[PDB]
Design a protein around this ligand. Sequence first.
Ligand SMILES: O=P(O)(O)OC[C@@H](O)[C@@H](O)c1cnc[nH]1
Ligand SMILES: O=P(O)(O)OC[C@@H](O)[C@@H](O)c1cnc[nH]1
Ligand SMILES: O=P(O)(O)OC[C@@H](O)[C@@H](O)c1cnc[nH]1
Ligand SMILES: O=P(O)(O)OC[C@@H](O)[C@@H](O)c1cnc[nH]1
Ligand SMILES: O=P(O)(O)OC[C@@H](O)[C@@H](O)c1cnc[nH]1
Ligand SMILES: O=P(O)(O)OC[C@@H](O)[C@@H](O)c1cnc[nH]1
Ligand SMILES: [Mn+2]
Ligand SMILES: [Mn+2]
Ligand SMILES: [Mn+2]
Ligand SMILES: [Mn+2]
Ligand SMILES: [Mn+2]
Ligand SMILES: [Mn+2]
Ligand SMILES: [Mn+2]
Ligand SMILES: [Mn+2]
Ligand SMILES: [Mn+2]
Ligand SMILES: [Mn+2]
Ligand SMILES: [Mn+2]
Ligand SMILES: [Mn+2]
Lengths: 199, 199, 199, 199, 199, 199
Amino acid sequence: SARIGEVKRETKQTNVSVKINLDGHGVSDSSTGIPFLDHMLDQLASHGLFDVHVRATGDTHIDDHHTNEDVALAIGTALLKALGERKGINRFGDFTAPLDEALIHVSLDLSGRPYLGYNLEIPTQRVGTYDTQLVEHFFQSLVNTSGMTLHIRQLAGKNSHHIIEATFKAFARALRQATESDPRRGGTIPSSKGVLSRS
Amino acid sequence: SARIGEVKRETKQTNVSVKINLDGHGVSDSSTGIPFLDHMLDQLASHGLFDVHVRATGDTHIDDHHTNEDVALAIGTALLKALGERKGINRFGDFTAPLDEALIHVSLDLSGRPYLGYNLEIPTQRVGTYDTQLVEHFFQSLVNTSGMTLHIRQLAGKNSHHIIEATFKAFARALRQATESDPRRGGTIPSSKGVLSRS
Amino acid sequence: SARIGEVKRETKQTNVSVKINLDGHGVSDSSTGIPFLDHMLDQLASHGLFDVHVRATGDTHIDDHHTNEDVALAIGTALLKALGERKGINRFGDFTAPLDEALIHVSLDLSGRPYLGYNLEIPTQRVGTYDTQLVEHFFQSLVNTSGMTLHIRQLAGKNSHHIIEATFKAFARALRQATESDPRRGGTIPSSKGVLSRS
Amino acid sequence: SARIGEVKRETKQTNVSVKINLDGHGVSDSSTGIPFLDHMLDQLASHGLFDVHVRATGDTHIDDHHTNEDVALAIGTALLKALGERKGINRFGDFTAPLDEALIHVSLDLSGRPYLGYNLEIPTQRVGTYDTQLVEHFFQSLVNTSGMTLHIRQLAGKNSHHIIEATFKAFARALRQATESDPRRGGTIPSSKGVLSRS
Amino acid sequence: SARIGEVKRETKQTNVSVKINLDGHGVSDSSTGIPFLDHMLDQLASHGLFDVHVRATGDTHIDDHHTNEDVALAIGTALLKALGERKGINRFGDFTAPLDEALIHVSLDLSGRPYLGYNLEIPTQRVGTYDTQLVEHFFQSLVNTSGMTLHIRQLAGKNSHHIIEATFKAFARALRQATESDPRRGGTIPSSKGVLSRS
Amino acid sequence: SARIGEVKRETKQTNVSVKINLDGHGVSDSSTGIPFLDHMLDQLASHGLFDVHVRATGDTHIDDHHTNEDVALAIGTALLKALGERKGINRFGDFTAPLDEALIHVSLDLSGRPYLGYNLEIPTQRVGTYDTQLVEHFFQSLVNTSGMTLHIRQLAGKNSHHIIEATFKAFARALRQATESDPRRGGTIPSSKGVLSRS
Ligand SMILES: O=P(O)(O)OC[C@@H](O)[C@@H](O)c1cnc[nH]1
Ligand SMILES: O=P(O)(O)OC[C@@H](O)[C@@H](O)c1cnc[nH]1
Ligand SMILES: O=P(O)(O)OC[C@@H](O)[C@@H](O)c1cnc[nH]1
Ligand SMILES: O=P(O)(O)OC[C@@H](O)[C@@H](O)c1cnc[nH]1
Ligand SMILES: O=P(O)(O)OC[C@@H](O)[C@@H](O)c1cnc[nH]1
Ligand SMILES: O=P(O)(O)OC[C@@H](O)[C@@H](O)c1cnc[nH]1
Ligand SMILES: [Mn+2]
Ligand SMILES: [Mn+2]
Ligand SMILES: [Mn+2]
Ligand SMILES: [Mn+2]
Ligand SMILES: [Mn+2]
Ligand SMILES: [Mn+2]
Ligand SMILES: [Mn+2]
Ligand SMILES: [Mn+2]
Ligand SMILES: [Mn+2]
Ligand SMILES: [Mn+2]
Ligand SMILES: [Mn+2]
Ligand SMILES: [Mn+2]
């Protein structure tokens, strides 16, 4: 009864397949056509202990944007599917993680209501070939399909790779917390209104 | 083949029923337990030509918040249902409407991607018994379930009732435009990527 | 059943005759004794498709003010007469028009309630022999007798003739929109309160 | 030959009846459904010596706005009717009145041309249950149907009830002055252009 | 051996009864005469897993202040009673929780020394009928009788209901953490000075 | 009698072929050697309903500039050819379109007089391999050969791809409007001076 979400999503621009196990062992298996994003998805598996399987192709000759967005949308849907009615879970996650001089605080609530608060200030435009504007878009798209309340707050940082990587580490650990079983909940839905829904 | 969306939504806090006809004749039939919101929903019908049927009850002794939110969520879902695959529609709407000294520009895209840009500055806290913070929440919740890109821009205004009412008038007219048939489209999906989706 | 409004207005200072057809073909026939105003009224006909007949004489040796005002008052009354109960009309108009570097946004509502919002900053005092303060007065007087809510917003412009002319072009197109038949209205009055009135 | 104006005005939102005698003895008889407004209308009678009869009902569960506006519109029309051709009157009124620390200067001209200049800064949002934004709207609507040039200038004041009440006292006295017979006029129209008109 | 604290507290102004189980299952049973406060106390149970029983009556016709204060004082005493010598507990709690755009960080230490650090900026005066100044007073009074060091820090937020609710969610989770058994402590008092005391 | 403009333009630096149908069905067929520009030209077809055929080659090893410019010049000439004497057309177009957080207002007049007003602030230097300075140059060159008055105004936006794409969407819709038949014009030239000319 591991919670597994699977999504296939295709448009004229991109083709995406995602399989995520919330109760994983950190199996990392991401190939998006965007090497830096693959590296970040590896962090999600390694530090979140999610099993993360992603395959994507797309119109990277135009730019990485459509692929990045469509991967994020599909991951969000996969998370939503895996989570189901959200019975017995912690629901909330909260973690601050460094990478050297960078320090990122991530707080999230698996509420069913999409919201992104994001204040990263990434001081360079490209990390490798990866457009650093795409980080915000990745998280925005992911929250929109997952129905997640997500806050990402930059507390320190100078190196762009460090800032983004620390964000994924903190996110992975916050998401792990939120998705894990609350040992006291007794399988009840963790909401005073009796339901958690993306509608 | 009128496009009609119907939603019933209930929680421990509220009970909501919505029926909206996109191809209506402005039939107004809204009773939310929040008189000012009913007045605004009347504008949606009158100026958008939507048929709007809303019934809600809820925990207004705590405050109008949960009712307001839950009505908005249900309306957004009703719009999504009515819109279907979004074939043959204008998709985009754009209108600036006054009410006396107030002037509000609303621009929207039935994109499938939720976003609210909102800059109203409503100078009083209560219009009648209605908490003016709830206007932003109404639109935010509506975009989240409808999969709408929505921008609301205050160009002028001093009277709070005028500001909010002008917003609903402009929104109604922009939404009417966006939902109406594009006479040249020939029933094609109005997107270069071949699909419009909330996922 | 073309909607035609006719006004004769005389005082000790001026003598004015106006005939306007809302359902016209752009017949331009304006002679006010103020050549620049005649040029602007020509734009109203050409871009609004109104048939515009104006004759005025007055005390232009004192200045153009009284004539300009009295022409505007009479035009506003003519519009009010032509509009009648305002059944079946769009009611609202909204257009932004350029003339070269100038760009003017006009938004109006045939509400029955006079209001002018005006922010033009015309950088010279005379266009030909025409006092550029008289532009604001023209629109103010027109809204007062027509029962129009009118907003005029200068978005760009440097040449005074361009600024004023772009204003008349945008106004003409917004007014055309507002006066035209709403194809869905089914002849109903476009107001939730059941009536549109200058009282 | 007392100058009496009577108006009945009804919409889907409100029902209003007004009778005003310009040559009254201060008979106060106002019941609008808005107690604070009734108190202000009492000042109009007491200090203006108008006989003021007002009855209104309306949608106060939405808010007091529509009632307040519609009462003001009807009062303005009643004044216009009572004034007729404005022969033999002072036409202009000018008065500054205090209420304790508050001091309000009101200047008006029964010109036929609506204009409101208003600079009150009322430091609280509610006086009793009365929304203090509605004061400006009351005067704006009244000038629009009466064809009055009206300037209201706050010279001092801290208490909101005092500020608004002093405004009505000053207005009542300015309006009394303007409506009263000029003992030298000899029944002539007090305008160099030979007529005073709302058109 | 569930840790249960019970308090009955009465004055000439209020009557309060509280029963709290630190080792609860989130049983919510709060009726204070202040609906918004009841909603917040529901969050304490739902997210803290405390069993919370509160009954209060009082002089709400004067305002909600005395009731709010006296409920808070009684809850604090109930917590103190339930906690006893504080053997074997985590003692410290730390959590940041969102509600949509709002994000509140709560840190607390069950030290025996009362202190409130509070920086919320709640942008409206009333949530429903609840005076938003009373939030600070609730926490101040609670810390004073419980002997708690409590810091409440607003990281983001615009909607007053969201800000206050997120505060209670974060507080509930921090308090749950602090009151729970430390699995390594071996029942020792978690203080280098050998005792934790409100004196 | 579809309005079709065809241009072949060659220099030592570039070779360009353009065919545009103003009365198209959104046939997209653009290959410029600049993938991002191709994506933008696809928007022109999809949202403008133009049939757009572009082939270009050029000195992209130097940079994309000459190709971008020469494509724009050729498109402008193609539009001019297709438009002819501009009889019976709307002439003016005005639209504000979003893409998520980006919001761009485009206003244009097919006047015969070239002018570009442009205020985009695109926060990154490269979208994919496309130099973001080239957007302004594309529109400037296009207006110069088409004889178009064009204003592009950035109202909101953070993502460079979104800002540029929203610009093309708004432009396409404004241009569609301007080129479409005015149903009332009766085939007259929409100018008070009797002619529209690039000279
Ligand atoms: O839905 P939640 O479990 O976060 O909490 C219940 C209710 O408070 C919540 O729906 C709410 C949303 N906005 C204000 N409150
Ligand atoms: O999906 P749209 O039809 O708004 O346009 C296609 C594609 O450009 C779009 O998916 C996109 C999203 N972000 C950048 N582009
Ligand atoms: O009269 P309108 O049709 O613009 O809308 C009805 C009512 O809302 C309107 O009379 C009003 C005026 N001020 C606030 N509302
Ligand atoms: O109409 P009055 O009586 O205020 O004054 C005559 C004339 O000067 C007046 O109509 C005018 C209006 N604007 C400038 N002057
Ligand atoms: O009492 P605590 O366990 O927080 O720590 C012992 C001692 O350091 C503490 O009493 C103290 C108080 N002020 C400074 N130190
Ligand atoms: O040429 P148009 O149709 O925009 O309008 C006629 C005339 O006003 C115009 O040529 C002009 C140019 N500059 C000022 N006016
Ligand atoms: Mn995107
Ligand atoms: Mn790394
Ligand atoms: Mn909410
Ligand atoms: Mn209203
Ligand atoms: Mn004048
Ligand atoms: Mn000209
Ligand atoms: Mn009003
Ligand atoms: Mn008093
Ligand atoms: Mn106290
Ligand atoms: Mn709540
Ligand atoms: Mn160049
Ligand atoms: Mn794109």
